[PDB]
Design a protein around this ligand. Structure first.
Ligand SMILES: *[C@@H]1O[C@H](CO)[C@@H](O[C@@H]2O[C@H](CO)[C@@H](O)[C@H](O)[C@H]2NC(C)=O)[C@H](O)[C@H]1NC(C)=O
Ligand SMILES: *[C@@H]1O[C@H](CO)[C@@H](O[C@@H]2O[C@H](CO)[C@@H](O)[C@H](O)[C@H]2NC(C)=O)[C@H](O)[C@H]1NC(C)=O
Ligand SMILES: *[C@@H]1O[C@H](CO)[C@@H](O[C@@H]2O[C@H](CO)[C@@H](O)[C@H](O)[C@H]2NC(C)=O)[C@H](O)[C@H]1NC(C)=O
Ligand SMILES: *[C@@H]1O[C@H](CO)[C@@H](O[C@@H]2O[C@H](CO)[C@@H](O)[C@H](O)[C@H]2NC(C)=O)[C@H](O)[C@H]1NC(C)=O
Ligand SMILES: *[C@@H]1O[C@H](CO)[C@@H](O[C@@H]2O[C@H](CO)[C@@H](O)[C@H](O)[C@H]2NC(C)=O)[C@H](O)[C@H]1NC(C)=O
Lengths: 346, 346, 346, 346, 346
């Protein structure tokens, strides 16, 4: 038996097969079972509020008109040359900003037809999916990325999207992301769009990502801590030496304002306040109060000797008060964020 | 009755249907009723003077030649395979810089034909629409984005664009923009282009966006206020200590010039002045006058003791004059902008 | 009379019409009358030496083979479906780096055929035209943008490009550019390319743009003036206080070098000098000479009291010499540039 | 014998050749022998975690149906006009983010058919292949780039990919990369993907790249060494002069924090620490301890003469202690990294 | 005689002309004579190691099958409608990273057929050609850009590429590049690729570009010279005033490190050292030695009056030693680079 003509007798003008008609035209809705295989993950830009992903989308459905028994082979691995002449679901990604196929040597498509009439349809896709991100608790935040698979033309009585009981979302082995950590577990919700044109099917997955804090502690917490400790040096400097103490005040706030403005380089402008802003605002208040303390002792020292020992008493108290009032804030910052970020796991 | 041949008898060579001829060729103009559904909104770049939007454009019109009665179904959900062989309006966006369709799995199109001959045509579009923006009152400004839907080839006697009485512009639930706030109400104007080639139909919507101020107060108002308060420390420093007071003058203007140049990072170069420039120019005049005040008291102190108490009197007056003259400016800046920005709601 | 067959009898195999043959094959050259309508203007990047423009290109020419008398309608508004099967001029833009059509819903084309056989052909185009820019007199410069419309395949004996006597270049109402001002008048030159392949027709327009100076005076003239005035404070400071005066010298040149390097952020590296460089070089010489003046008085003061009053005399003279020598330069800078920029209007 | 009809008799409807059927349909798997020729290499972006490469992909396989004996020519150099009508392997690159063909004048393809029925298929490709990079030991790191060639539709019983015994990967002569060094040797592994759809063939190459350190020593090691030596000047400055010594402390850490933040300009945010961070953290601890040493001697000097010589003793010890404790660290940094980077050659 | 049928009789099924067969199939190789016309030149990015160019590629060759005598016209200006149905060389650019055609209104192609059977084929192309650049002697370097035109499918016995004796490379009048100078003369080498697939023809041109130095002297030589002269002020300052002299030391190196890091903004990271690095390293050594000189005189001054005049002697010597040792370096830097850059013209 020739391989070429079997495609003609199975589908075409001779058999009356039409690619514009769904399998069960006036019967039960077509149940399309979908699953994905994340080949790559990355390019998560916070400013643009989206992320890039490369997936292998597989779809399975039953077509009674494509049932065959002539060839004894249980499966029929078919090239994508007739993929434009069989009926396919009109799946689309609702949160997608930009997508394209892959044609590096040939069409990156797979098609298989089984004896019972089922059809396996695999494709390679690159997506740039939008993600509404909440940047509160910025250095220590669990984000949730979204992915919706919804039909465009067919309603609930025509097309239904489902997952398998077996691994709907598989991730490639060894895929490690630079700045976050992909959780093993995933959430499969069942969205359903309700437009003025009618009802449409939809399926949704959730990806939980945890940001890595190490970079931020190396960049905007340890150097800011060093700057605050540096400002604490002024209590040990001689109270008479005015240019030295003011230089320790002013140069500290000089570098701190630049660090505060530079800590929000990648963050998209957001009206709410972040935990990083709380940290660098409290540290800026600490070093500004340190210079205002000198502005107090310098005016106290000139009141003309009970004003001399009183001037030294502020320096002695502040030597063992500013580190205590900063260690308390560190406890009230590194505990209230390891409690609440732990809360709201999902 | 077969599904395949009904499309042939309804339209094609057998029925004489032509896609190059409008429905009422020599009769009343075709009334096309349009509406949109904003799926996503964002990427509003001020430098490029445009914004990005992803919409679902729906068009409805009556075609007498497409009236059918053979199939008892009231509606006929048709795949987009014959969308290139029926008559469609030549709609285009006048303010569009760049647009494309979506073909992530199949064509993102919808087509429905009813018994009376009406046609429903839905499509998914991504647009980059130009927006003439006025950046005066920059930190607190209500912008207005524009969207025009105009025919390219047909005139008023052929094609007419209209909205429904029901929700012409619908926005997806949960769509929150990073830096602005989309008003619930919308304005539907009725533009009409008048070129040398004739008259053309047009319809226009207006989107009112309010910028969020929080980011700006965290970045270029609170740190500038801290810098001005820091410059006010020099009145409390000893008048004899020349290097300390000049260091408090110069380092203040050193950081202020960088902050003034850095406050216009994203703003496209604009000839008019902004409210941010007024704020940082007045604050720069305040800290420059503070250093010029020291330049006055230092020259007054050396005139050789009536010149000593006179020198101290300027410091005592300026301790309770600069905050008063700055609080008055704050009243004359945070009231004249909450009055006028409130004015001109549209 | 049917609408469909008239296109077949007017042009096609039955009538012998060929789209590969110009109307007057062995007669007078075809005169194509062109005009444009600038829908948008902007994205004038100085670094890349080009600008972006979106235009409506209209072309008019006579085709004797397309003359019709059967339909009583004077004009024949035709969809762009046969625009690929009629003869069209092979116009191209010589200074174009990148261009594309627009297909947001359908083809953005217009075609009209009149009784006498004339053809009106309108199209929507987006262009990125290169512009050779001269950046001398940078803050105050009149640039000239260029746009050439030239045939690629046909010579002078075949194709001739012309303008109308009526408004060849029309600009959309309300089009205001961010950083420049488009002059109302335009120049229509008549270029003619002379390659080794022969002679070709060409038509050229000129757009005169004036830069807006306000941004630059807010950024690199007023702050530099404030810095120079700040350096003039050192004459009023006590001559004995060495760290204060040197701090007023050094911090001034510290900020000035950064401002001089930062004033050429967008300017493409150019070998010639600009007016901004002249301004900031003279101001840098003024503040460097101010510190060298202190380097003179400090060495004069220690020569061991005729050396004391001599030291004070330089400070008293320089108090009323540096502003006079800077006001003279301001006159010799703001007059020699309002004379010469006024000159060379075209 | 005509050249045109031989292609028709060799393949087509007359001969029954089908491009949708692999050569040995129900026999042994088709063995495809592949090799590449790297025409260009570069654009290795660390932030995006990928690299760009332009290659000449050559594939060789046997087709019994294409065996010919009519033309005495041993080889048949065929234009790519029938490349779409013969069977070709569905090769694809697994780690590819973006790829395209080349059509600068014509299709950049080559096809040769020999007497025995073998087929040579050469193509020009541009790839943007993702590379999982490990940035530990950043200034001195051996990276490994990856390239996988895997079939999409055919399994192990159908398609098998192999290399030659002769030069599978050839590099163009004179190809020198800006920032790395391509090793002469290459590793050819034999990957095999195992998806839920079945087994697939795969072949993999490895490219070993060595970063060039010179740029980094000129930028963030020599200037940091100069800064640390500059901080060592404060031991030679007079212990009484408080503003001079604190200015040598503070300005040093002022520039060092900017250098530490600026050393990670191109590096993508990574949670682990790098060797550059170790270097600039130890140097920051050295200069911060130098200023804390002054904060110790200044407080020791005022205890009211056994406190004077004790104050000078710390300065004398630190003159010959800080360079010794820094030279030891240099030995413990430039040896532990020339041992371990040498280790793990592959 | 009709114009339409002559194309059919000259080429097509009736005449047996095949576009898949070269003119002399089993005879001498086809000699294709090529020449270019650079319409635009620019966008030479050093970081990406490539440049952009827009050219008019003209090719001339003889086709005996296209010889005609029926039409008395010596030349036959043909539209590009049959350019896909005649034989054309498979030219490609070996060093090209990205290229595209131009279709702004129609296809930007030209075709002419003469009586003897010769064919003239002109096309418009935009290229992004890679250029291996050597950045040593960066401010004053003669670069060489490359352009290779090589066949992809045909070998030496089939296709041969040649230039004319008359102007192979023509440049448009008035083309002035921003940052370099294009030499009038050009080098035409004769490359010949030798792959494992066989021998291929190739032709190569060379473009010599000279960088303009003016921008660099305005940016990183004159301000660095001013900084070094500023550091020379410290010799004239009083030796007792410690904070003034150290502030002149430290602020100088503070600005110099930023200038040294900022002088390599556009340069791609390169392991070798550049002339700019030599210049700013020597100037950094000069200002660091100036501060170390103060660190010497300050320690010499306190040795308890033979130590006082000895301290002043270093200041007096260094007043007339540092400018002499810097002028000698200027001679040994501005002569050794005007000798060697002059050498190696090609
Ligand atoms: C697609 O799935 C739906 C839901 O599982 C099927 O609908 C059910 O079909 C069974 C079998 O006839 C009925 O007994 C149920 O009453 C149906 N339920 C509903 C809610 O309709 C449907 O038959 C499936 N279609 C196909 C083609 O497999
Ligand atoms: C499209 O809408 C216009 C305006 O509503 C219609 O024009 C009117 O048609 C009615 C019915 O014949 C007339 O009585 C009016 O005089 C018309 N007004 C104008 C200004 O023309 C038009 O008929 C509609 N066309 C279709 C096909 O529905
Ligand atoms: C296109 O325009 C040219 C120039 O106006 C026309 O050429 C002239 O035609 C008139 C009418 O026959 C002659 O009297 C002149 O001698 C011609 N001048 C030249 C320089 O050739 C030409 O006829 C026009 N062609 C068409 C088709 O309108
Ligand atoms: C492709 O290569 C495989 C492996 O070399 C070949 O499979 C072998 O073929 C020989 C010859 O018939 C047998 O003796 C071996 O037992 C086979 N081994 C396996 C593991 O199958 C195969 O024949 C080759 N196919 C072609 C078309 O050359
Ligand atoms: C293409 O050019 C080559 C080289 O000029 C030609 O080859 C020569 O042809 C002449 C004329 O028959 C012979 O006498 C020489 O011996 C040939 N030399 C070589 C090295 O082959 C060739 O004939 C030209 N082909 C065409 C079609 O013009």
């Amino acid at each position: 038996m020739s391989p070429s003509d079997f495609l003609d007798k199975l589908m075409g003008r001779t058999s009356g097969y039409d690619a514009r008609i769904r399998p069960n035209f006036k019967g039960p809705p077509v149940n399309v079972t979908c699953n994905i295989f994340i080949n790559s993950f990355g390019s998560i830009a916070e400013t643009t509020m989206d992320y890039r992903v490369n997936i292998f989308l597989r779809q399975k459905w039953n077509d009674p008109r494509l049932a065959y028994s002539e060839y004894p082979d249980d499966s029929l691995d078919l090239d994508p040359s007739m993929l434009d002449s069989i009926w396919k679901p009109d799946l689309f990604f609702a949160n997608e900003k930009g997508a394209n196929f892959h044609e590096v040597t040939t069409d990156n498509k797979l098609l298989r037809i089984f004896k019972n009439g089922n059809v396996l349809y695999s494709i390679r896709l690159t997506l740039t999916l939008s993600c509404p991100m909440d940047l509160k608790n910025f250095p220590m935040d669990v984000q949730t990325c979204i992915m919706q698979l919804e039909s465009f033309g067919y309603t609930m009585n025509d097309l239904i999207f489902e997952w398998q009981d077996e691994a709907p979302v598989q991730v490639a082995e060894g895929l490690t992301l630079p700045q976050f950590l992909l959780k093993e577990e995933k959430d499969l919700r069942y969205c359903t769009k309700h437009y003025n044109t009618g009802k449409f099917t939809c399926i949704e997955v959730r990806f939980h990502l945890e940001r890595q804090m190490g970079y931020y502690l190396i960049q905007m917490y340890i150097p800011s801590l060093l700057i605050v400790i540096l400002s604490w040096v002024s209590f040990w400097i001689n109270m008479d030496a005015a240019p030295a103490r003011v230089a320790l005040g002013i140069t500290t706030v000089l570098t701190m304002t630049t660090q505060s403005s530079g800590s929000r380089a990648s963050l998209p402008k957001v009206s709410y306040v972040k935990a990083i802003d709380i940290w660098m605002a409290v540290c800026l208040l600490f070093v500004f109060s340190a210079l205002l303390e000198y502005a107090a002792v310098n005016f106290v020292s000139r009141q003309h000797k009970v004003f001399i020992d009183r001037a030294k008493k502020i320096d002695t108290i502040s030597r063992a008060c500013f580190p205590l009032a900063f260690l308390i804030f560190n406890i009230f910052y590194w505990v209230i964020y390891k409690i609440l970020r732990h809360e709201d796991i999902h």
